[PDB]
Amino acid sequence: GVYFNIDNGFIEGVVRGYRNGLLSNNQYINLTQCDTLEDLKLQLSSTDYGNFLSSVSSESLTTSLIQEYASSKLYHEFNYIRDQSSGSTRKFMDYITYGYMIDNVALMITGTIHDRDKGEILQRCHPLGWFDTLPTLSVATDLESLYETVLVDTPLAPYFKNCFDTAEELDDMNIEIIRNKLYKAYLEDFYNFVTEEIPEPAKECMQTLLGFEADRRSINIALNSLQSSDIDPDLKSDLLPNIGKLYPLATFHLAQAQDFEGVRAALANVYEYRGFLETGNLEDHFYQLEMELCRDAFTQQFAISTVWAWMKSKEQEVRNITWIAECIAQNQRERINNYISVY
Amino acid sequence: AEKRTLIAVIADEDTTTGLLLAGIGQITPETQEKNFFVYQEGKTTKEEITDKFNHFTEERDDIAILLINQHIAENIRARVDSFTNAFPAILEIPSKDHPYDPEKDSVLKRVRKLF
Amino acid sequence: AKQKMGRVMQTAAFSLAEVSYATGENIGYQVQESVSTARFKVRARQENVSGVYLSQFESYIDPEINDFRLTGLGRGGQQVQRAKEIYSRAVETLVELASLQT
Amino acid sequence: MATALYTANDFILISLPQNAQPVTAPGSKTDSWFNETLIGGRAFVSDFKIPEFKIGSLDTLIVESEELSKVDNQIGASIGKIIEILQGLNETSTNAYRTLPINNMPVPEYLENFQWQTRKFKLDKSIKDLITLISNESSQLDADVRATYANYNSAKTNLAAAERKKTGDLSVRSLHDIVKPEDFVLNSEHLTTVLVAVPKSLKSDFEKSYETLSKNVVPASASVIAEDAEYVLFNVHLFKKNVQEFTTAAREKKFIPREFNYSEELIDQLKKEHDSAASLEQSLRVQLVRLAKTAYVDVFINWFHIKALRVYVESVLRYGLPPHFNIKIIAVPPKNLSKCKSELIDAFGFLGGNAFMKDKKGKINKQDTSLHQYASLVDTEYEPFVMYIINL
């Protein structure tokens, strides 16, 4: 914390200011009391969202347009913080967007197998994961002619190290394999970047926030492989990241997990993930643990992990606002308090 | 008789995705054509709904039930009213963001005459 | 039965809309590409109601496909898997009700 | 404002009882105060008293206020669209289309003779239907200007697309301004012509190899009929069986074949496609500028109708006795609006309520939760006296 504020003095204090706009529990209870999407817009206008839906005017206001604009101002705030970044900070900001570039690659090359139009499969793409040759993934079908033509000049190029193209072009079954393997190599590279060049207070609390991403992705790969996959464990172990808290003993048992109990008995030996697969919504368990790991990353001051802990908390805020606005527009209020608020 | 086992969809994009998750349409193996028509508001043609309705009702006889959103059915009303058979069945079910409205329903018009 | 079907479709339809915006991508394109069999099919049968035989449908679920091979969207992927579970049940209500219409 | 006026002024419409008095500087007649006192005597005060309307009931009065508010925003919206379409077209003046004198007669001056204009609106009619007529008129006009522009934008895309087909890059261009029977054929029985767009680097390689690329090629036919800065356009005449082999050999070599036929219908259709797109855009263009202009004036008179009626309706509903109100429209010279509004709030606000008059200079606007609200929809603070502010 003695050399932090040279290049990161202005960057943190604005992100710390962006943290104070996170909605508290009372500001969520005041949103669950709304009756109309217009009343929810006017309730959000008193927060730090104020007049972000001003160009809508009560007629074209749907519950997806709120999720569009509330996330769009997240993305513009992220771009403003990234434009003032330099050196290792700017590289850290780029490494965050690489994981959205991977999702936009895997969403762009499924819109060409199904022959859906290129102008409408790109408005569903993520704005932070934009690289200049992203629309040109609609030129080929197989993996080799999409790597060697487009994805060499991208920063996703070192991540195609284990994607074995056996000259089968593309179905929907192997694009998910390529997606999981790119995200695996990306989690490896970004963990080594955090361990290598990020300073020490923003190292230990970022290795945990990133090992949680690896553990959640390992459990989701090892649990989605039951229903819509029939694969060997030696080919399944190339999809599980090896940086996390869960790797050396439990991802082996998640690799040969043929049943739901093969996952549950594997996650019963790890201490902080046991009980997730017993009761309740599992996705809510992962989002709750994500927010509890992002809350105590703001409590360490001179850290660049506050950017990660801010944007994941602000994404959870946009998800909670989207869930509430979905509840108060479809007139279902049995689970309106299913939001996640640690702030 | 038992020769019809397919459900065709005429529905808005989000509704057709849902029905398809459940699995009721497909890409036929004898003709290479969907048993679904994906529609979007203000971005697809009035003529295309017409072609799809005819295709599933009269130029297909392996469709058991054709589900159709009332709102979409309305666009192509002449064609919905004019198909009067029960093989395949034509069933208007309430569209998205609309409850039951009796004024868009082809079958209820038929029932009025005689009881 | 028209209202019952309207509702069952609408409540499911909205959940599907929510799942799509929250994860961060449009799923419906990928789902259309993966499907090339129809899981829920029907068997025709004649039931005598009054003098005349009417046509009835009884749905049967055939295990061609279980879900679809597209989910792997990390954390956001659980929202899509659950969305299918809620819809498979909704569609079935529509189908049994749909038989009466015929 | 300073660019959204060029011969207008900005206006405050207020209504007070004929018993109202100023407490800014007591002892003064309301009429005298507006002229002498309000911002250094610079205030131009004009009459705006509109006669009675039938009113059916107390319940119905409430419902009237609801309609006046929504429509008035809707009409404001409709003017926003019309002005946006004129700028879009590239109609900008120094005294129009961003100010626009109502019917080519200054704006403060129009309001001075706006004593309830009649265009199909009658002062002995029922209030409700008139509100509906004014709103219907504007809406129809709004659909008209929008619909015509849509067709204008679409028409422009056809012209642009077509300009590349008549001369541009070779990937959508084949000649059809000119047609000769020794550069193009397809109305033979044995002969056809296929055009090959060959990159300028590859050009010398095309002249050497073309004969050999397929069998039975017309000797010495390869010449540059057209040229740009990326690709060159060639004619080669050959035997009809060879046409498939020829195209195919060529794409491998990395020359790129350009589909053309000496079919008359296609040649005639390409020229016509360009001409017709232009003809269409031109017709739409005149019609659209005229329509926007006519629409503008009408939408403006309707807007001023709503505001005048909305201040009368509000005034009777809050004040009660006396039956007749003293209504004025005060033209504020530019950028002194705030200081003007403050001198009024302090002068007249006392009538509304002793605690309900706060000092405010500039429109205070609140919209945060149900603890702060400001609008005619819902409010929890507002103007204590009846005031609407009109800005162009």
Swiss-Prot record, chain A:
The keyword Ion transport applies. Keywords: Acetylation, Hydrogen ion transport, Ion transport, Membrane, Transport, Vacuole. The gene is VMA6. The keyword Transport applies. This is V-type proton ATPase subunit d. GO terms for cellular component: fungal-type vacuole membrane; Golgi membrane; proton-transporting V-type ATPase complex; vacuolar proton-transporting V-type ATPase complex; vacuolar proton-transporting V-type ATPase, V0 domain. Subunit of the V0 complex of vacuolar(H+)-ATPase (V-ATPase), a multisubunit enzyme composed of a peripheral complex (V1) that hydrolyzes ATP and a membrane integral complex (V0) that translocates protons. V-ATPase is responsible for acidifying and maintaining the pH of intracellular compartments. This subunit is a non-integral membrane component of the membrane pore domain and is required for proper assembly of the V0 sector. Might be involved in the regulated assembly of V1 subunits onto the membrane sector or alternatively may prevent the passage of protons through V0 pores. It is found in: Vacuole membrane.
UniProtKB/Swiss-Prot annotation, chain B:
Its main location: membrane. It is found in: Vacuole membrane. It comes from the Eukaryota. One of its GO terms (cellular component) is vacuolar proton-transporting V-type ATPase complex. Keywords: Hydrogen ion transport, Ion transport, Membrane, Transport, Vacuole. GO terms for biological process: endosomal lumen acidification; Golgi lumen acidification; proton transmembrane transport; vacuolar acidification. InterPro entries: ATPase_V1-cplx_f_g_su (IPR008218), ATPase_V1-cplx_fsu_euk (IPR005772), ATPase_V1_fsu_sf (IPR036906). The keyword Acetylation does not apply. It holds the Pfam family ATP-synt_F. It is a peripheral membrane protein. One of its GO terms (molecular function) is proton-transporting ATPase activity, rotational mechanism. Belongs to the V-ATPase F subunit family. Present with 4050 molecules/cell in log phase SD medium. Subunit of the V1 complex of vacuolar(H+)-ATPase (V-ATPase), a multisubunit enzyme composed of a peripheral complex (V1) that hydrolyzes ATP and a membrane integral complex (V0) that translocates protons. V-ATPase is responsible for acidifying and maintaining the pH of intracellular compartments. V-ATPase is a heteromultimeric enzyme composed of a peripheral catalytic V1 complex (components A to H) attached to an integral membrane V0 proton pore complex (components: a, c, c', c'', d, e, f and VOA1). This is V-type proton ATPase subunit F. It comes from Saccharomyces cerevisiae (strain ATCC 204508 / S288c) (Baker's yeast).
Curated annotation (Swiss-Prot), chain C:
It comes from the Eukaryota. It is found in: Vacuole membrane. Subunit of the V1 complex of vacuolar(H+)-ATPase (V-ATPase), a multisubunit enzyme composed of a peripheral complex (V1) that hydrolyzes ATP and a membrane integral complex (V0) that translocates protons. V-ATPase is responsible for acidifying and maintaining the pH of intracellular compartments. V-ATPase is a heteromultimeric enzyme composed of a peripheral catalytic V1 complex (components A to H) attached to an integral membrane V0 proton pore complex (components: a, c, c', c'', d, e, f and VOA1). Interacts with RAV1 and RAV2 components of the RAVE complex, which are essential for the stability and assembly of V-ATPase. Present with 8500 molecules/cell in log phase SD medium. Belongs to the V-ATPase D subunit family. This is V-type proton ATPase subunit D. It comes from Saccharomyces cerevisiae (strain ATCC 204508 / S288c) (Baker's yeast). The chain holds residues 53 to 154 of 256 of the full protein.
Swiss-Prot record, chain D:
It is found in: Vacuole membrane. The modification N-acetylalanine is found at residue 2. Signal peptide: none annotated. Its main location: membrane. GO terms for cellular component: fungal-type vacuole membrane; Golgi membrane; proton-transporting V-type ATPase complex; vacuolar proton-transporting V-type ATPase complex; vacuolar proton-transporting V-type ATPase, V1 domain. One of its GO terms (molecular function) is ATP binding. The keyword Ion transport applies. Keywords: Acetylation, ATP-binding, Hydrogen ion transport, Ion transport, Membrane, Nucleotide-binding, Transport, Vacuole. Pfam families: V-ATPase_C. V-ATPase is a heteromultimeric enzyme composed of a peripheral catalytic V1 complex (components A to H) attached to an integral membrane V0 proton pore complex (components: a, c, c', c'', d, e, f and VOA1). Interacts directly with VMA4. Belongs to the V-ATPase C subunit family. Present with 21114 molecules/cell in log phase SD medium. This is V-type proton ATPase subunit C. It comes from Saccharomyces cerevisiae (strain ATCC 204508 / S288c) (Baker's yeast).
